[PDB]
Ligand binder design. Structure first.
Ligand SMILES: N[C@H]1CC[C@@H](N2CCCCC[n+]3c(sc4c(Cl)ccc(O)c43)NS(=O)(=O)c3ccc(O)c(c3)C2=O)CC1
Ligand SMILES: Nc1nc2c(ncn2[C@@H]2O[C@H](COP(=O)(O)OP(=O)(O)O)[C@@H](O)[C@H]2O)c(=O)[nH]1
Ligand SMILES: [Mg+2]
Length: 169
């Protein structure tokens, strides 16, 4: 029987949560995917020789209090906190997603990876060192990815699974 990893992809609308998830599932870049769709995406994978199932929740903006967001935060075992390297505001929002997860879990240590998406884009606004420094302060990995060219997409999810395994082992 296969271990199922419940992963949640969080971050400001338009950073590429859906593109990243679809890239992992379908090996395809979507130019557009309806920004209001919050749904689960499953994939059977082998990570470091572990045959397992990834149950990935790709999330939507919710401006006010959301009982269902709280419940996914309670349920999720690992979180990809995604910003876009060309969007400073999405980077600044990261701290708010991390705080919310921690408050819901009532825990300062929760499996998480920081993801800087759209690494293919030549015009960056968020310095790598700045993002790396933040990750260091949180004690989590930092990966730069491109849903468009597939750069580090597997790496980002697989790293998160590694973070979940190590929390336990
Ligand atoms: N797009 C439509 C159909 C799905 C629906 N939806 C989101 C999918 C819920 C998937 C079950 N689930 C969860 S949590 C969760 C996690 Cl942490 C990881 C992987 C999961 O599959 C998962 N189900 S749940 O009851 O907490 C939940 C939370 C938020 C939601 O938007 C929904 C369900 C939901 O209604 C939203 C409307
Ligand atoms: N250039 C580039 N664009 C991307 C990347 N990921 C997403 N996008 C685009 O950014 C926009 C928002 O992506 P989407 O996946 O819907 O983000 P979500 O709201 O966070 O789900 C869409 O136009 C995507 O095509 C990437 O790695 N590189
Ligand atoms: Mg989306």
């Amino acid at each position: 029987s296969m271990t199922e990893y419940k992963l949640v992809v969080v971050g400001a609308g338009g950073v590429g949560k859906s593109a990243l998830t679809i890239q992992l599932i379908q090996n395809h870049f979507v130019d557009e995917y309806d920004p209001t769709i919050e749904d689960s995406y499953r994939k059977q994978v082998v990570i470091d020789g572990e045959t397992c199932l990834l149950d990935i929740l790709d999330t939507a903006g919710q401006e006010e209090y959301s009982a269902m967001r709280d419940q996914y935060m309670r349920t999720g075992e690992g979180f990809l906190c995604v910003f876009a390297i060309n969007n400073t505001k999405s980077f600044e929002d990261i701290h708010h997603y991390r705080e919310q997860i921690k408050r819901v879990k009532d825990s300062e240590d929760v499996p998480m990876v920081l993801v800087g998406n759209k690494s293919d884009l030549p015009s960056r606004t968020v310095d790598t060192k700045q993002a790396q420094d933040l990750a260091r302060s949180y004690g989590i990995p930092f990966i730069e990815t491109s849903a468009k060219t597939r750069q580090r997409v597997e790496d980002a999810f697989y790293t998160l699974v590694r973070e979940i395994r190590q929390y336990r082992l």
